[PDB]
Structure formats: C-alpha cells, structure tokens
Amino acid sequence: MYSIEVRTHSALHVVKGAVVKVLGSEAKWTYSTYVKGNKGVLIVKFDRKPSDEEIREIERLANEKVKENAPIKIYELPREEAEKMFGEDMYDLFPVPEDVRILKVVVIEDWNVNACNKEHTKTTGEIGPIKIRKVRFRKSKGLLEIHFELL
C-alpha cells in the first residue's frame, strides 16, 4: 500500500489542479508545498483570499478528481525535451535550477503538469477524500496557503 505521506503528497497535485480550475491562471505558480503525516499544504502566488464558496468548490473539484480515479503519469525526460513537451507550466514559481538536466514530470491529464521528483500513487483514487481545513492569505507577500487533510 501507499504510505499516508505519498498519498498526501499526491493530493497536492490534485488540489493544485482544482485551485487553477477555480481561481484561474492567476494562481498557477506554486511557491511551495510540504507534507507532514496526513496533512498537506499548498502555497501559491495569488492576490486575494478566496471566498468560502470558492474554497468549497476547490475541495469539491479535488474530491471529484479523486473519484474519477485518473492516472498520475510520470515523465522522465531530458530537460530540453521536457520544456518542448510541457513548456513553462511544468515549473513552480522558482524553476528547477539549471544544473538539473533530467526532469521527472508528473501529469494528471488536463489538470496538473509539474516537474517533481517525489513518489506518487498510481491513480488519484488511491489518494482518498480530501478536506480543506485552513486557508490563509498573506497580502504583503502575495501568497495563498491551502491547508488540507487526507481523511
């Protein structure tokens, strides 16, 4: 089976996709992410605190993607090829340093594309129900934190 950490990290990709679907391209750049147990935190560059409605919709879409049990594809490509294939969208706010010449790219079709070297579940269904616990907007820094728990 997959550890709760691997499942929670995989959830970050699902939640990020939902975030972009609801908030739009203005929220496409991830500042950072981290997992501790069954708790995951996604921080993206954004300019406002979403409404409770928007937060609920992000949660709904995330769970719906998990329910769809879509495959989580992993691409291991030379950096140059990865860029031609996925473009800038595969990067986070801070692009992978140039000394890294081979990239592993995670892909959830029409949902999320991200250069990531961590371990993931094979499908989104293996993640399980997700619950957003806290959302915090840091105005000065222009960062939106989404704290969730994998039930």
**Binding-site residues for Zn(2+):** 9, 13, 116, 120
Assess contact for 22 and 136: CB atoms under 8 A: no
The reply to whether 90 sits near Zn ion by the rule CB under 5 A is: no
Per CB under 5 A, which region of 20-28, 55-63, 108-116, 134-142 contacts Zn ion?
A: 108-116
Q: Give the CB-nearest residue to Zn ion.
A: 116
Instruction: Using alpha carbons, select from 73, 100, 96 the residue that is nearest to residue 10.
Output: 73
Cβ distance to Zn ion smaller for residue 5 or 54: 5
* Residue 105, strand partner residues: 75, 115
How far apart are CB 119 and Zn ion at their closest, in Å?
8
Q: Tell me the backbone φ, ψ of residue 73, rounded to 5 degrees.
A: -75, 140
The reply to whether 21 sits near Zn ion by the rule CB under 5 A is: no
- Alpha-carbon distance of 23 to 96, in angstroms, equals 24
Cβ distance to Zn ion smaller for residue 96 or 137: 96
Cβ distance to Zn ion smaller for residue 33 or 63: 33
Start-end of H helices in the chain: 4-23, 52-68, 79-86
The reply to whether 104 sits near Zn ion by the rule CB under 5 A is: no
| Interface residue list for Zn ion (CB under 5 A) | 106, 116, 118
